[PDB]
Design an enzyme around this catalytic site. Structure first.
Site, PDB file in Angstrom:
ATOM      1  N   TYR A  56      14.326  35.064   4.633  1.00 34.19           N
ATOM      2  CA  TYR A  56      13.585  34.489   5.767  1.00 34.19           C
ATOM      3  C   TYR A  56      13.844  35.303   7.022  1.00 34.19           C
ATOM      4  O   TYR A  56      14.528  34.835   7.938  1.00 34.19           O
ATOM      5  CB  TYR A  56      13.960  33.030   5.974  1.00 34.19           C
ATOM      6  CG  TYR A  56      13.118  32.300   7.005  1.00 34.19           C
ATOM      7  CD1 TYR A  56      11.750  32.164   6.810  1.00 34.19           C
ATOM      8  CD2 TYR A  56      13.695  31.719   8.138  1.00 34.19           C
ATOM      9  CE1 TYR A  56      10.953  31.472   7.719  1.00 34.19           C
ATOM     10  CE2 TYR A  56      12.914  31.022   9.050  1.00 34.19           C
ATOM     11  CZ  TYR A  56      11.535  30.909   8.845  1.00 34.19           C
ATOM     12  OH  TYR A  56      10.807  30.212   9.771  1.00 34.19           O
ATOM     13  N   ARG A  97       8.067  36.563  12.591  1.00 36.20           N
ATOM     14  CA  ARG A  97       8.292  35.404  11.735  1.00 36.20           C
ATOM     15  C   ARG A  97       7.600  34.182  12.330  1.00 36.20           C
ATOM     16  O   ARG A  97       7.458  34.036  13.550  1.00 36.20           O
ATOM     17  CB  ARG A  97       9.812  35.154  11.611  1.00 36.20           C
ATOM     18  CG  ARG A  97      10.198  34.265  10.444  1.00 36.20           C
ATOM     19  CD  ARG A  97      11.716  34.238  10.219  1.00 36.20           C
ATOM     20  NE  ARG A  97      12.376  33.563  11.346  1.00 36.20           N
ATOM     21  CZ  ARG A  97      13.697  33.538  11.531  1.00 36.20           C
ATOM     22  NH1 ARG A  97      14.516  34.124  10.686  1.00 36.20           N
ATOM     23  NH2 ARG A  97      14.188  32.936  12.610  1.00 36.20           N
ATOM     24  N   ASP A  98       7.202  33.269  11.448  1.00 34.42           N
ATOM     25  CA  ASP A  98       6.736  31.954  11.885  1.00 34.42           C
ATOM     26  C   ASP A  98       5.488  32.098  12.769  1.00 34.42           C
ATOM     27  O   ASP A  98       5.401  31.560  13.852  1.00 34.42           O
ATOM     28  CB  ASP A  98       7.853  31.171  12.570  1.00 34.42           C
ATOM     29  CG  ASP A  98       7.611  29.702  12.719  1.00 34.42           C
ATOM     30  OD1 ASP A  98       7.038  29.082  11.756  1.00 34.42           O
ATOM     31  OD2 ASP A  98       8.070  29.128  13.738  1.00 34.42           O
ATOM     32  N   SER A 114      10.642  28.972  15.251  1.00 33.92           N
ATOM     33  CA  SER A 114      11.467  29.766  14.372  1.00 33.92           C
ATOM     34  C   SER A 114      11.178  31.262  14.493  1.00 33.92           C
ATOM     35  O   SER A 114      11.445  32.017  13.566  1.00 33.92           O
ATOM     36  CB  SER A 114      11.449  29.291  12.923  1.00 33.92           C
ATOM     37  OG  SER A 114      12.160  28.055  12.836  1.00 33.92           O
ATOM     38  N   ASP A 162       6.601  29.972   4.424  1.00 30.07           N
ATOM     39  CA  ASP A 162       5.459  29.851   5.342  1.00 30.07           C
ATOM     40  C   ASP A 162       4.580  31.074   5.416  1.00 30.07           C
ATOM     41  O   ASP A 162       3.434  30.983   5.858  1.00 30.07           O
ATOM     42  CB  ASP A 162       5.908  29.468   6.758  1.00 30.07           C
ATOM     43  CG  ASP A 162       6.777  28.224   6.776  1.00 30.07           C
ATOM     44  OD1 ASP A 162       6.538  27.310   5.931  1.00 30.07           O
ATOM     45  OD2 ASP A 162       7.665  28.134   7.654  1.00 30.07           O
ATOM     46  N   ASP A 183      14.697  21.913  12.819  1.00 26.92           N
ATOM     47  CA  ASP A 183      13.458  22.686  12.685  1.00 26.92           C
ATOM     48  C   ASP A 183      12.982  23.311  13.971  1.00 26.92           C
ATOM     49  O   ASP A 183      12.035  24.109  13.969  1.00 26.92           O
ATOM     50  CB  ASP A 183      12.359  21.768  12.189  1.00 26.92           C
ATOM     51  CG  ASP A 183      12.605  21.201  10.815  1.00 26.92           C
ATOM     52  OD1 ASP A 183      13.030  21.998   9.920  1.00 26.92           O
ATOM     53  OD2 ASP A 183      12.338  20.003  10.642  1.00 26.92           O
TER      54      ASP A 183
HETATM   55  O1  LIG Z   1      17.596  25.326   8.126  1.00 26.64           O
HETATM   56  C1  LIG Z   1      17.020  26.417   7.382  1.00 26.64           C
HETATM   57  C2  LIG Z   1      16.271  27.363   8.297  1.00 26.64           C
HETATM   58  O2  LIG Z   1      15.353  26.532   9.024  1.00 26.64           O
HETATM   59  C3  LIG Z   1      14.483  27.286   9.871  1.00 26.64           C
HETATM   60  O3  LIG Z   1      13.595  26.405  10.435  1.00 26.64           O
HETATM   61  C4  LIG Z   1      15.306  27.962  10.930  1.00 26.64           C
HETATM   62  O4  LIG Z   1      14.476  28.798  11.745  1.00 26.64           O
HETATM   63  C5  LIG Z   1      16.366  28.874  10.311  1.00 26.64           C
HETATM   64  O5  LIG Z   1      17.194  29.365  11.340  1.00 26.64           O
HETATM   65  C6  LIG Z   1      17.172  28.123   9.259  1.00 26.64           C
HETATM   66  O6  LIG Z   1      17.892  29.100   8.507  1.00 26.64           O
HETATM   67 NA    NA Z   2       9.724  25.770  10.447  1.00 27.88          NA
END
Ligand SMILES: OC[C@H]1O[C@@H](O)[C@H](O)[C@@H](O)[C@@H]1O
Ligand code: NA
Ligand SMILES: [Cl-]
Length: 358
Positions: free
Chosen positions: A83, A88-89, A95, A135, A313
């Site tokens: 991830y 990202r995101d 995130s 995602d 989140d």
């Molecule tokens: O909790 C699991 C993952 O959730 C994501 O929403 C966060 O951005 C990450 O930092 C985290 O590793």
């Molecule tokens: Na998220």
């Protein structure tokens, strides 16, 4: 499929989550909720490689798993999430990560993969299961009108391909993230999703280590709902088993007998959202069905806990550069800290609201 990655292995418990849960349990002030909260550390979860700084901890997990297997005569399995895409995101704010497409993002990402591969290569008696980039592919199905996602598409595909291609060389069993029933399970999204997953599988050489898809990661849907959640109106695929039952034959037509894993770590409590798209720190969520290969479906290798409940989140603070309004909706627990950081009150409610109970 014949080879379920979990059969015959003992899952190495996340030390990262264990440390969070032990600290959290000591703060829960009834001794019995506290004992139940502490027991969560014995429930297998996925550990997220959400930054490159954590790659040496992957190394420690692999080496610790190897020694635990030897001490017990067991074969150990380490569960990770890849991830760290650049940009990202792309359809949300909460995130956003350390790499950006405009600043060498793809090159940074491929170096991140190389470092992960280099760790995994050193511990061949440990099995690894990886969820690939939650995602990302789902955003490329439904969110190409989001300009950040449109402009990220070529980079995401390149990065995901690099991850799949190179993790396959060290025998990692992989499930590429595939959204959830309320995202890709709409009947009209099934074929564009299957077409993309098929492309991705083909570009990575159809490695047999690419087992299939992960669903419901960091979401709250039922696997098999007693009755449709009212947020699902208009979509006959109101839970994950309907989504998977509908998607899997399209993949099979396209040549790939994919299998699936389904996150249930925050699915114990249904009917807690205004709209299906409410994803952030949903209030009243409970831990759901524990991980198991007793899944109820030919297509599903395991129920899993991918998102570790208690890790936030997204922040509700509108002064943060990572503020997303989804994280201050009426069904979003507030105030909430930054994504990925511990949210103690949210954890304790996950424990009290667990279904089945802990
Ligand atoms: O909790 C699991 C993952 O959730 C994501 O929403 C966060 O951005 C990450 O930092 C985290 O590793
Ligand atoms: Na998220
Ligand atoms: Cl836009």
């Amino acid at each position: 499929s014949a080879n379920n990655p979990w059969t015959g292995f003992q899952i190495f418990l996340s030390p990262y989550y264990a440390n969070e849960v032990a600290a959290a349990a000591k703060q829960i002030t009834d001794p019995t909720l506290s004992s139940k909260a502490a027991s969560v550390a014995n429930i297998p979860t996925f550990t997220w490689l959400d930054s490159v700084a954590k790659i040496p901890d992957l190394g420690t997990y692999l080496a610790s798993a190897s020694a635990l297997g030897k001490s017990t005569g067991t074969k150990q399995l380490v569960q990770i999430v890849i991830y760290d895409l650049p940009d990202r995101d792309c359809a949300a704010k909460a995130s956003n990560g350390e790499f950006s497409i405009a600043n060498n993002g793809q090159a940074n990402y491929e170096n991140y993969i190389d470092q992960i591969v280099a760790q995994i290569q050193q511990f061949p008696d440990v099995r690894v299961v990886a969820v690939i980039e939650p995602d990302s592919l789902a955003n490329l199905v439904t969110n190409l009108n989001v300009q950040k996602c449109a402009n990220a598409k070529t980079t995401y595909l390149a990065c995901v391909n690099y991850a799949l291609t190179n993790l396959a060389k060290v025998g990692v069993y992989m499930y590429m993230d595939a959204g959830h029933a309320g995202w890709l399970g709409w009947p009209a999204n099934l074929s564009p999703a299957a077409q993309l997953f098929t492309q991705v599988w083909q570009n990575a050489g159809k490695s047999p280590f690419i087992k299939g898809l992960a669903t419901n990661v960091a979401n709250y849907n039922a696997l098999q709902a007693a009755s449709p959640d009212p947020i699902t109106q208009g979509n006959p695929n109101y839970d994950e088993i309907h989504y998977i039952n509908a998607l899997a034959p399209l993949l099979q037509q396209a040549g790939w007998d994919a299998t699936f894993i389904v996150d249930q770590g925050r699915s114990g409590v249904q009917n807690i959202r205004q709209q299906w798209g409410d994803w952030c720190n949903i209030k009243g969520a409970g831990f759901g069905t524990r991980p198991t290969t007793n899944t109820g479906s030919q297509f599903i290798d395991s129920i899993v806990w991918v998102k570790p409940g208690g890790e936030c989140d997204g922040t509700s603070n509108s002064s943060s550069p990572r503020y997303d309004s989804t994280c201050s909706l009426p069904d979003a627990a507030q105030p909430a800290p930054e994504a990925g950081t511990w949210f103690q009150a949210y954890f304790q409610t996950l424990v009290s609201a667990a279904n089945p109970p802990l």
